[PDB]
Amino acid sequence: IDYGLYALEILAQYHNVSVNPEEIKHRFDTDGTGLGLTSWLLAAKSLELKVKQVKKTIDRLNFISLPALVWREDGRHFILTKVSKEANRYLIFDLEQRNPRVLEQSEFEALYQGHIILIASRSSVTGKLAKFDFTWFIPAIIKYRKIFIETLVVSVFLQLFALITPLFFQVVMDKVLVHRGFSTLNVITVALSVVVVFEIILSGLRTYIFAHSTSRIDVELGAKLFRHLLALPISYFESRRVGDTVARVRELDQIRNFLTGQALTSVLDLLFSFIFFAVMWYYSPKLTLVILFSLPCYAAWSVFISPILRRRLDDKFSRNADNQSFLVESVTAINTIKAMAVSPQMTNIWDKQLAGYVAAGFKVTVLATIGQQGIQLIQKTVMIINLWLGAHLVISGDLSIGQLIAFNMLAGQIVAPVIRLAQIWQDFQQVGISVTRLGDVLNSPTESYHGKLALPEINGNITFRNIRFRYKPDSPVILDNINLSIKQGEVIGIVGRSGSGKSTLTKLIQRFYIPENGQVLIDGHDLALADPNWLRRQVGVVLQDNVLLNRSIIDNISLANPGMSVEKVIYAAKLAGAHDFISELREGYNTIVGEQGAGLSGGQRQRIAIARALVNNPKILIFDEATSALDYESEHIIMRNMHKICKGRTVIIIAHRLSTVKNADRIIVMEKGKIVEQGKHKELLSEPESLYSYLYQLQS
Amino acid sequence: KFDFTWFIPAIIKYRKIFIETLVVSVFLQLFALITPLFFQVVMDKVLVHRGFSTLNVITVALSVVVVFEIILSGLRTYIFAHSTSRIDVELGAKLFRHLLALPISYFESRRVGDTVARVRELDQIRNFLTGQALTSVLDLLFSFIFFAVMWYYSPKLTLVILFSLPCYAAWSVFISPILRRRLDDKFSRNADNQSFLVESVTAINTIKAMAVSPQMTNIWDKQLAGYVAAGFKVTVLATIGQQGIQLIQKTVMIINLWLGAHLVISGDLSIGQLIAFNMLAGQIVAPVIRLAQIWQDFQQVGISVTRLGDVLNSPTESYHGKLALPEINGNITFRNIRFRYKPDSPVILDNINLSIKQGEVIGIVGRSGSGKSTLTKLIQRFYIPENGQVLIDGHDLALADPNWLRRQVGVVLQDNVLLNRSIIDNISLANPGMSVEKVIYAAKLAGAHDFISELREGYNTIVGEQGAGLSGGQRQRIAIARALVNNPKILIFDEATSALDYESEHIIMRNMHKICKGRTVIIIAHRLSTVKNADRIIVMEKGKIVEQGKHKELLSEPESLYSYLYQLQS
Amino acid sequence: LDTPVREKDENEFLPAHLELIETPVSRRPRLVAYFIMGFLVIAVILSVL
Amino acid sequence: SEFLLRYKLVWSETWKIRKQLDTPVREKDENEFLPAHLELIETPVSRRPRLVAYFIMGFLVIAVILSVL
């Protein structure tokens, strides 16, 4: 018995929030075998609570706000409440005995190890979703603000050392060579040595710390991106290609590559270069005005060049996404490519796409080179002007040779970050586009559910109320006015011709299809408002394709709960009539099936999927033409076991052959999206003019 | 073997432009050398003696020298990138042509993400080639002119720089292999992450139909954490290398300052000469600094080349070019074929002997595990028999062109995979420039026109995925139309009617005489009602022929297993 | 220096831990102060000598 | 070392077979209308930048030779 879940339930009851233990276990107990401390804290944070584990002495135990949870290494936690003074007694809540009990000082000291969890109710009252832009990083900067202040301090100090080191050259030129010097030269040498070594150490530390923090920020962004991607509707994926979304996701790797680089440090160095300007103006304002006028030239050149580079990199990303889509589709469907002789066509398409991609990349490279050359031209022109003016100043007066050398080195240190940034212009614009692509993925609405309440478990009461459905916004109506009501524990057979609309009921019970008019109800709850995971985790559906994952047999069968026992897996495999073939294999239940079940036949993975659906305890079980892809002497075992599979469940069987639903409580016949007949088997076969009788005679 | 000798013929083929780039590089080095001489002249003969006209001459010469140097550097970069783009295009074309020719066992034993990442290593190589990494190497290599000028100025400081260079070499040698190992680990993690992402996006229907978001999210979290940790390790090593380079640069700068001060104090060296020497020493080191911040690019292009070699060094099931063997007449025969899935797996077929004549509609039946499903994958040279020979029109299939054979033969399977294109783009996959009337006729033959009629977009309807957006029967009819729209001499139906209802199957069976006209058709199905109208029905049991003949010829005798199967089916 | 990525290094970037940890601190919290004070004391002892 | 010997052996082997790797010379319009990849592979560098670079290099050479004498 998991006691952390019970403790969370009790503490949520205390703080006036409703918690469903099954939903919390589904979300935060992915691998079974209990919750664990980290997942327990995450689950508590999910319920809009404020929790944190603290080290609290028994003496300090009197000043905390109870109730609080005492987390032990072994799963024997207990909730502490009402620490009583004047009697040194503790009114714990025993999670095993499920009732409060009164303890004294001694046994509490024996039972308390030094760690307690403090629980507070902090429910945020705010409903809104913000558009994903560059502003998403502002809360990240706020959260990681200690590190960034540290790096700002380090940058200021680095600028201080970089200001110091010109001055020693100036002093050498103006005193060591002018008069003489050997005593001062050694002092300057040792001071320069210590300055350069400490500058190197500080730069290394700054890079290390900044890279660490930006890596953590990127990890957070990636986690959020994957959560949102998995929370998206199926209509999002049905209208796209795999390669498009894959490329959108690898833009995250692009962002991570940018963040852990020299771009932001170079920007910091550029913004902290006004320290040098004070000394530059102190030397000669006539020379410093040149730099002050040169900076707007750099800004104007960058502003002029940037949008063209952005457009070119947009085209480059379009070609890259097309290449990724084509490559993924070609490798995924390599069996079809090889079975036919469509290799020349695929190579022609690849050659066209590759040529386009290389042309776009070359255009981007050309513009980057042009921008770099322009910035170099501006820098060199400024250097020439300063050389001429400094020559006049030194010949005339008010300037020395050492002062001129120091000013030249200071101007070089001013301009070096600009050159370093210009070398990575492509990265800047590529990140500007990566953020937009990640927004394109992240600005799509997820599967919406207004109800934040935790609905209870499902009884098999399904109700269709005036259901009207279309595949597309203007396609022909599939279901006109479907009205239906299915009670708990009832086996329902649904038959009809192909195109009658009986194939859309399975994806309507699940929230994959959105009815144009009407509402589908489970236990009287509208599915347009319920949390999709709650509905999906309690409904078992066996389709006609049934694709698997590239894992072993037992990992695919027990995918929904890896922590369950093997014996139940064997029982489920026996029910589906698949244990035998799995055993005939050399590795048995450890055989890897390959991509999409490549190592198994169609019927084999059909039976594997039947077992996978049966391994849990589905409140509602749907068979959407499951046994049609199977053969004889395998469907017979399926029926003999289905005699007891339907026990305690609401089972819906949608089949083409009328012999499959012969043993159902009701048989619902559909024709062109309307229910024409319903009843038992013989009650429907009594009328020879009915559609059911016609189909039965036709197939027989 | 494709490791690095592949680029040598590409370099030599474009030698006449690479030599020009080398000459432009040496001229850029001369242009760079010009300017410190002008500073030395200004410092020694303008600030000291007199005059402003010589200063004006120096300034006006320097302006045009700088402009010409900038233009020449831009032109050299453009020409080098233009020359390397052709090399990377050639590499990409060759890589994909090799990839499509690989055997199916290569793809069956790996994941999609592995191959996808190994091909994005091509993009990594392209970014390395079309960049400013080899130009910096050229600048570093062509710096001996600076060394000659510096040795003319002063031998001691030139010796100091000459001894500083091996420090850079040794530091690079010491700090390179560990960075390469860390980037190997990072690439392995990246390949795993890409494979997981592709697998999860491809099967999103099952991820969302079930409720395993938390499992997928946990796996993604762990993989992302590992990948970012590896990236951080690589970044730390790169930063250590850059700081190590900076330490040597500044140490030799300080030593040069001290020695130059002592030199100028003792005569035999002017101040302008020292300034010019310092600028030349900085210009020598600048390529090293600019190359030390793209260290990961060098190691990553090495690793990308290694992975491209991993893809390109595997043997190909490419071609058998001998006399261009003519077309196929539908004559298939088997001679003592036995087949094993793996060398350590139970045998399926033992002594299957068969012979099918042209224009003969033959049906093959049996139970699960009978081994009838492997004949279609044996006719195409996908499965290689343990011993024996499969003969089509008298010619062995083990020595023929695989593409020719698989083009002459059309196969419809129990489940078929389309592409994410329109219906007409899937039907006419083998010939996209083909007339639409042929596509419509083929679709009408398979009965696929009727269900397309209720589609708003028509034949332009995009199949959402491999088969998403269409039902099983619709996909089967589309696959039948795709097989029939060509002119295949041999048609194989490998349970190609399981997903169809009674009406669609009846419509297809009414057109069977138009489908089988002039072709050798082999029908394989579990149900016995599909091969009823066949010219010959064959029963298989555990990889052996137990019965053959017409349906009645077999249905008349209850002693046969065919009668038992028909009784069970009814 | 060339040790592979271990679980200790991997747990530092686990998104669950980053979600739980509020107001994070740098891995090297006091090194900058130590180095800056070292620089200051070395400078002050060099100035008097 | 040893690897450099192998690289030099390969370079010499493929440099003796030189004059066969070169593609035929073609006009610009004929280069333009080729398969998509082949017209990147076989299109040489434009003539204008080559003349600009040659003019700059010759200007430098002329300036040096006139200034020295």
UniProtKB/Swiss-Prot annotation, chain B:
One of its GO terms (biological process) is protein secretion by the type I secretion system. It is a multi-pass membrane protein. Coiled coil: none annotated. One of its GO terms (molecular function) is peptidase activity. Part of the ABC transporter complex HlyBD involved in hemolysin export. Transmembrane domains (TMD) form a pore in the inner membrane and the ATP-binding domain (NBD) is responsible for energy generation. The complex HlyBD-TolC (OMF) forms a single transport channel across the two membranes, allowing direct export of alpha-hemolysin. These channel is involved in type 1 secretion system. This is Alpha-hemolysin translocation ATP-binding protein HlyB. It comes from Escherichia coli O6:H1 (strain CFT073 / ATCC 700928 / UPEC). The lineage of its organism: Bacteria, Pseudomonadati, Pseudomonadota, Gammaproteobacteria, Enterobacterales. The chain holds residues 137 to 706 of 707 of the full protein.
